[model samples]
Target: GSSGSSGMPYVDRQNRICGFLDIEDNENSGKFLRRYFILDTQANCLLWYMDNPQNLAVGAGAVGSLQLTYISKVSIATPKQKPKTPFCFVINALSQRYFLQANDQKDLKDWVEALNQASKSGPSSG
Candidate 1:
């Protein structure tokens, strides 16, 4: 039996996608810094936080919670500038284009997959 770990981090935190990712800073010199990210279904949005775990623990001092309904697209950036990181992806909505790099290839795929699934047109009649 090939009993081995996939070398991927795993856990269940309120069923929300939580992890650290690098973002191509907006309106700057194009520096990428890692940020804490969280995507929640019930909240219908994604969150961006600094690397400081303390900030997320209190759920404050963070970037705005991105509401998914407004997101127009989410996918890999390369394969654009021949991006420096192969794991990079973009989540764009209207005028805002959030380019982020996952820590691993698998992490990048999952974020793109889950983010795409999360953003959808609602048939809310309630």
Candidate 2:
């Protein structure tokens, strides 16, 4: 059996919150684009992969990961210095920043609230 895997977002407050967003890999550059992301509460960081294929493991093609504790903010981006696209937001830690674009306002709110809440609450075992 083949299970379709594309544009999947996850949440339950157990140990995961994963989804897709267009990431500005580099500012003022055009190569930045959509990629897969997973907010792993267990690991206490968000992770990204080049692809989210066939329920693949993180080891399949791990791009990078960062510390959630260092997340300083998650908020709507000002268009003047934003992703230059629709449904954009910004997330910044002590050392890094990512410009992300969601496909819808609702989805953006969903992600933003979850990320904001997660960073505030940190990890929990329930």
Which lDDT tens digits does candidate 1 get at residues 1-126?
A: 553445544332324577888776665657876678877667778877876556456756666567886787886887564367788888878866777889889878888877766664222211
Off by over 4 Å in 2: 1-15, 57-61, 122-126
Model 1 lDDT at residue 111: 84
**Each model's lDDT:** 0.70, 0.69
Work out candidate 1's RMSD over C-alphas.
11.0
Range of the 10 consecutive residues with the lowest summed lDDT in candidate 2? 117-126
Clashing pairs in 1: none
Cα lDDT tens digits, model 2, 17-119, are 6678777667556566677777776677777776674578745865677578788778877777763566777886786667787878877876777677667
Q: Give the residue spans of candidate 1 off by over 4 A.
A: 1-15, 51-59, 121-126
